[model samples]
Target: MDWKKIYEDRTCTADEAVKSIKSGDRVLFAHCVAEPPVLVEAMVANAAAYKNVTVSHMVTLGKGEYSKPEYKENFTFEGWFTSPSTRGSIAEGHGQFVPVFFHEVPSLIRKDIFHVDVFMVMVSPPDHNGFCCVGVSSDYTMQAIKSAKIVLAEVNDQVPVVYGDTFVHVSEIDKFVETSHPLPEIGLPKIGEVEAAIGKHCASLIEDGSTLQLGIGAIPDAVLSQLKDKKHLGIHSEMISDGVVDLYEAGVIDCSQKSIDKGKMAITFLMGTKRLYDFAANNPKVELKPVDYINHPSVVAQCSKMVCINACLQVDFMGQIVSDSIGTKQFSGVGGQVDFVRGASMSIDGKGKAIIAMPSVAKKKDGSMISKIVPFIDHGAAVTTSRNDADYVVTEYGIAEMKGKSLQDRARALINIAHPDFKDELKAEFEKRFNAAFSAWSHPQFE
Candidate 1:
């Protein structure tokens, strides 16, 4: 069947189709790898004629057209996850940010609390039955599509027709925009020597054939690189970035040890380079399910040797993780950190690990005086993960095991990983809070 001839009636120029966008419309853009660039660009270009158009989404992987200041008058974006591209906006009061967990974002839209008027997504070219697979990201897009008044889809051959609950009939698309650009690529963030050392420390703990859940970026990739000689690793992550690409390609990830989804990797969404998408196209080993499945606590506990690794913006001496905000301002969302942390803690075989990794002091900007770790959390900061769920807290200084430790002991372990310049100050603060006798007992030999 000739697609052009069969669907010619639904085709419209991007600009013409985008012109239908009206003022005050609460639009939901597709997340991550499923971002429809052509449609986004068209809408952004025509945004000058619109106003108060609340465009919303989670983490975005490709070019961020909506965040451009040119759309400031017409569009306002509220995100559940903060990418660096949008972090400044959320901080500077340029836009809004919400800190809901990944599993709840769908329900938020469906219940009319965070309404979606138009749903714009990128999908695989229509199947024989006219269905278009949601491909890399199905998490909240399904819920958005369900509640949206109008649906726009970009029919791209590049989108893989992934298996699982991630499809929509092409007939359901109110407007079809043709697009063919290669998906965006996530280049490996360069790892520094310190990060490599920290990663190696974390890698030393993994046994051969252990199943893992990893977060994005340099340290996780660094940890993965050190595992090249290991065997049969499995991934049951919430989302996967570029780090896992080579491991899967080299057959290091057999998923053979996993009890649930055995011999397969399950994720709700993906965001990486064009190579990652190309590698995933029609691949049978990968299953992209909904957030309710991928991030559910019970579903995650079924995997064996469960190792869940995540990153944080800040952590207190007691291991309260702050991932969503910079102090009181909303930066990112809660996501599935606790879901996996708690689930991994209760693994079926009782062998599980939860790792929280971050640099001791991530510089705010060039020569900025501020640091991420604070004596106390900003007034309105939300505790993303509690000390009870925290097992391992890592920094360039070192990794510390916090599980089952007393409050004072937890503080001693965390202070060991704090910046050397601030260690004494932190130790003094710890002593002031818990008593000098406890501090001496905990860190008597710290020079």
Candidate 2:
């Protein structure tokens, strides 16, 4: 019953651990920075021995050589989400995508919708009791570990021990590919004029004692930058990046006033620089949990003044959010956007705010600008968030608060924020459809 003995016995070379995987197996690597680079490299190194091995994950932060066209005959790729590393493969017809809610990813595994034959992951060194922390990510990795027959890992000494439902006893692991490596880092994105403007507008809606799900990218970082003067902000998000670390350390995001999980951040996963990893290491204030609990609508609803901030690819005049794809192209995944949107909308005391923030226009390859606020969604685009779920849409120009507004009002409000070049075009369409002469509503008019 000695845990250390079990750990030593299971520990093996990366190549040896990968050989345990057979052809035609469904392999799930850990999500984001928690992915095991050594195991994936070993699989590619020993590629000649395999046939039809399916590789999958939420996002592969490293180079995905298994998805290379040369290995198309030996490996199949089906990602639950897409990243720059795997997007080309999917676009080239060598890969596929599965659309599912972030919170329900575990449900897919639990219901046997996708049986995981092998789960390749990374973990911190075992604690005194021989339990290892899942570290930077504990989202859906736990579900894969429980359902997988081969719970193989790269036992990384450098991976920080994060708190939450993040431990896995050495006895539960089938194989260990021992390693000591630095985790991937996501630095702060550059905040452009449009992004800063949108952030300022988003900050205006976020009051003191508000719980937030700050998403990734420029706008989210912009929002964080603008929130330094605020008081008692809490986080109950699916993920957090480097910007949050600054807020937390500055005492702006203390989580001191949260209605639930008081004085602790109820987060499911992490993706940031080494500073964030170190901040989470053995830090009781940060709780890394499963996506289901952290992103669940019911749980998110209980936070103090829950305010969900998400970004999108395109939004229709009627308030439908197209975040996951560019038409049918599968740019990303459903993610926790809808989950947090609904949860924030249902925040107790009617103080919750669900915000979709983006630039009013997107540029083309030729440097031409096009309106992102469309008269209707592009052909074949699926609505990631429905009009009914829409609450606030903030662009650099202004904020269009959608909930309780009529369809005509929503269309008019959206057009008001559209680029000046496209305002007339959108207003013309608005007039034709609504059968009423357009009277543009200024930002102050709505206020």
Candidate 3:
């Protein structure tokens, strides 16, 4: 079989390639940085010719034309994980949100729960063996491509070649659109004082040789910044950003003590600046596996002394975390927060710890401050991480241990770490709501 001949025969113009799609067909767009720009543009350009075409994906850094309210009848955009491009669409009723754990995404696609008629992805040009790499993102892509009725790829020269289950043979692709657009890059957020304090508190819990599972953001970068002096810190995470590069260069993250993948930094995806891509490309130490292997609780627990750190929007006194919603308005989708939290909590020999870090307060639209540590979750807010799974909650003030603590103790701890202006109010509300004898316990002064 001449795979090269098959690849050349399948290559077509973007408009010609999208002709295969029809009304009522479900299409799976690649996730995040790997979304094919040319293919997406073609899909939107031909939207007027189709009806009831549904496009599902996690996150894509592109213009979401199909998600507009005007195109609601022509296309229904479903996002498994929300981003800025899709959030407004979902809230406006032009799109729908599918709630599922990150680890289960691939399985859902394989089991026909989330149907995929055509799978569109961005990939590197085929190598000598006629295999094209899925580039920076992996996650559910492998399964989507394997199960889709037809597979389409936008071949790009700039896409970085990564390892693990991120390759596809030319024989699998039904059509191709060549592109040379640069992949999107996100700048790192500058660490503020609040994030610095929270990071320090979260870092304090990590042991010398603990494995880490972290996502991208100010808090995760802050946490990585504080681990300069630590030794043999391994990374087995859902995604890696520029933060890991510094640790790797400084010899802090040797991954030598990781029981699962000795001396390898395992991640499911890569998202960061060009520097991050440069380092990960052809780097043997970095392995980009699928989410099922990277985020699975059973697999994550196998790494000894695992430490999972993530951020949440709000946490109630009872230790329930709301990471994806702001009073019923979808802020983000349920990501890998619950997966890593439970994975770390059930770590080998009880050595793991799950930490949720966020600022104590945030300013509202009116410039008034509101406590993030509330006495109760806001009405209609989604409970992303349940009370029983919460372990450590951190703020700029301090850390509050929630695991194994009673409801009264958890409330007291949360209040102590909350902003000073809100502590009394939180305590009063707790007392007013519960009205239990334990609510009478005096609040502690900030140390």
Candidate 4:
């Protein structure tokens, strides 16, 4: 009875919610597909009320209408990750990108530099006890809600009631604007021949009973597609997609063998098709938490055998990885690549593996292809993962185990996995650097 009264008193319309935002305020949208559609669109439609408002978020699947050039005078984006909705404006200087480690998101959001003036999210309908789940995203949104000057949420029925530390009582939220739009979805990627070949090699590196940190995209999906035969694999990831649902349903990912969070698919956020969302609705096996806790190196290391897989744009012969950018341009964020890399390295059982997988070639606008294994990273590109910290590098052709290998051996190993079309070119560079002839090894010399 008390909860219903409070819910009615706090509920507001989309237009009413945007009124709380002041000029120059930083409006932090909930991350990824969990962003509030009605609230964001209302804010943009009423752009005349805003001036120099700073719009910020992690990756989002919404249209990001605030980033439009027409609203340049009103809104400027400062986001953690780049996407199609926000990247165009960022390139044109209407928005800015900040490199971030996934584990630091909560702390950074509470800081003055990136602090939230207002936090907006989409939430599931309140339950009998007046508790609403934060739905598909907890990431850092939970922290923002706890820290922001005003906490506004869209009470969407389509939002699922996810289990774990995701409950937000009606009294906790400041204003509730209601909507019922379906959350955005990313369908299963079409696994190509190259992806399947790479998946086979990545799958080979993983052992049963290992806790996994699989990031999004085709490479991770391809890896998931090849994991059917595995038994009792556990997920301890920053985010998961629809492919994970298939494995979890097939009894492959029972999480029975995880040393920590046993029997739960521990995650920070969810992104995938409707099937994935439906799977998360009140499923006790699914547990969502803050990114800081989920991605903490020490927390992840608790898992006996952590197998972390991420994708990179290029890998130099020296084994430094460039994943977040193309030259000086920001393509994405640093995310949890290093967090899990170090975590896997410090695995309690000492059998953890950190894998970087990608296709051997990347195509240009004109359809010409270039090798991803390079002699040197392009000028101005940041080394996302340093040489000393690098681990396994997998392409369609094979795997390159970079740990403890000498520079010459690292170069040779990378060249071996370089596409056949670019192998000769890479070998020429290898010879030039070491002043030694390039000889092909029959297979990867794994440590």
Candidate 5:
């Protein structure tokens, strides 16, 4: 257990440790909060020192230095889940957005399809047995560390000593940088009245003992905030944030009715505050497993009464979902939205929902606001989820059921939920698309 023997006279600072990286080498930054900022910074500072080095992960809450144009020549950035920070860079040709289901990411790494040359991670300080926890994330990074040639650990006392198959021994780290700063926070942003209304609409769909699948965002948090009175609501999700912590602590989420991982909460990864880490650590009920187990559609469907809630950027009248981009601009990656939606749809009494709850209008590039509900999505916009897969679509105006409606009827229902200012335009677009006309004041039908 001697630290000296492990180093073997190798003395290197945090920056020096990352200097081992070379051109064409693929580096795997630990997903989410487990990202090592010091190592990431080292890669950025030495941007001109390497070429063809690919930096990849699902979602990163740290300073995303890899997106800088200067690093583009040296580092080819890649991502799976779509987040706000990486959206711009992806659109600008500075990186690649690989569309893969969350459950399959671990296997991709294990198979070397998305190979790794260096693994950078943040971990809790070595425990009495010379081991440290991945703290809150282990999805793809764990697999990378097992196969990569070099593993750099950011040993921080601040990292929580979490439990489960989410830990690694100090002996596994080929090099390390002493780290002590608190991990970055994915703080909740303020929700306006409209967003709040959307949250409430989503909440109304929740039934007692519902096994939930929720992504991270202000809306999801807002929805969780309103579910304090619901009982036995369990979580089986790809990722979770601080929003669900209070719900779990208040005995609102009992997991007693869930068939999969009954009496246990399973997740692929996590990104939240220190309090969130502390809540999961050594917590018998919280199980951090591989993504394949956490987000697999079959596994998710095993939990009866499943309620899958996911977010989207825009939606057309006929229920086509546009989540990855806006008008040829790639905004996000297709995460596990479709996987859970299909899973929930097959779970006999379950609720499968694809929610598009952005503000009715957003400011255009010219500073003019435009309605999110449109005749057609921008060219090249990816339909992450389809009309067939989506059941309940919610907005501030109300919810729309798209499971069995005809094209015209579906458009009318969606136009009803469009922003008040754009309802007329949306209705016009609907009529044009379906070749059916009716009074805007009255709902139209294809039958």
Candidate 6:
């Protein structure tokens, strides 16, 4: 009955813990910052002994040796989101990508879709009650751990003690490998002028008392920076970064008007500098929940005046959004864009806005700029958000509302917001591709 006795009995070497993994098993690794590096290293080191072993996760910061082509015969990397370390392998057909809404990831594992055989996670050292916190990521790992046949954990002292539905009793873990590695850090990037401009345009769409959901990157940071003067904003986002700290400190984000979890910032995960980690570590104002609850459209819609701002790589004249890929190359994942887009769309009438913000142009490998608002998405590129789900698309030039707009009207509005240097080319390409001309209703001033 003593949890401490069971915890001591389960302690083992990473190599020995990995031995429980068998061929043809679907192993789920803890996501993002909570991925167990020592356990993964041990698995890869002994991967040759197994065949057809599948490993899956949303994002991982460690060196992903299992994703390399050399291990293709021994292992299969099935990823929900491709990080920089594993993008090459997935792009080269050495791995597979699974498209799912952020909220549905837990169900994907719980319903035997991915069928987790072994669950590996990183956790903080046990507390007085012999419970280890799931640390920085409680996203889907909690679900997978509960459903997995075998649960192996790496007990790391550097893992921060995070409060939520994130605790697992030591007796629940079948085996444990202790380590003291520092948690990987993903530093915030410097927001650029174009991103700032896009942020400003996107910020204009946000009204007072809006519940905000922000995606990762410079644009979201810039948007948060501009919200310092706003009042009574709430947050029900999938993830939070360092930019939110200032808004929270300035009293701009008091979460006063949120219909759900009022006076609290609800986020599924945290990724940023040490400041952000420190701010979220046991902060009373912040609540970390599973992605299923945090990103559920029905739950997100309960918050009135919802504003979801996300980034994308490309937007076609038809308003289709490609956020996760560049042509056939995988860049990211569908993530929570569609989840929030639909959620915001269904919010209290006139109280929600789904905004896609990005620069209008990107420099190609040849040093020439290409329009991101293209006449057509490149062949093989996936549409993260469909035309019907799009609301407002923003660029450095202006904002274009796409909801209920016809193809010709959408094309005209999008071109108006594109960089002036590429407007002519975009219009020409649009006319050639769609066989449509700007009508009287399509010509409108944008200021």
Cα lDDT tens digits, model 2, 120-155, are 889987889988988888889888889998899899
**Which runs in model 4 stand beyond 4 Å of their true positions?**
440-447
Q: Residues 1-447, candidate 6, lDDT per residue (tens digit)? A: 498889999999999999999999999898888899999999999987889999899877889889999999988999899888888888789898888887899998888997989999999989999999876877887888889999999999888777777889897899999999777887777889998998888888888998999966789988998887799999999888888888898899999998888888898887777777778887778888898898888887787799999999999999999999988998889888999998988886558889998899999999998999898999999999999898999998989989999887889999999888988888788778777655444644642
What's each prediction's TM-score?
0.90, 0.96, 0.97, 0.96, 0.91, 0.96
Reference-based TM-score, model 3: 0.97
lDDT of each: 0.79, 0.88, 0.89, 0.88, 0.77, 0.88
- Model 5 stretches astray by more than 4 angstroms: 1-12, 82-85, 348-356, 365-367, 438-447
Full-model lDDT, candidate 1: 0.79
Query: After superposing candidate 2, which stretches have Cα over 4 Å from the reference?
Result: 440-447
Residue 338 deviation, candidate 4, in Å?
Answer: 1.7
For each candidate, how many residue pairs have backbone atoms clashing (under 3 Å)? 1, 0, 0, 0, 0, 0
Model 1 lDDT per residue over 1-447, tens place: 544454667877788778768999988888787888888889987877788998788887655667666667888878778777776677767677876778777778878998877888998878887788878887888877778888888888878777777898765677888877776667778999867876887887788878888877888888888888889899889877767988887778888888888887888888777667766668778888888778777887888888888888888867678877776777667788888898888788888888888888765657764435555666888888887887888887777888888777877888888888877778777877776543354544663
Pull out the clashing pairs in model 2.
none
For model 6, the local distance difference test gives 0.88
Question: What's the C-alpha lDDT at position 344 in model 1?
Answer: 83
Specify the highest-lDDT model's number. Answer: 3
Superposing all C-alpha atoms, what RMSD in Å does each candidate have to the true structure? Answer: 3.2, 3.2, 2.6, 3.4, 3.2, 2.8
Least accurate 10 contiguous residues by lDDT in model 5 = 438-447
Model 3, runs deviating above 4 Å? 436-447
* Regions of model 1 farther than 4 Å from truth: 1-6, 62-73, 363-374, 378-381, 437-447
TM-score of 2: 0.96
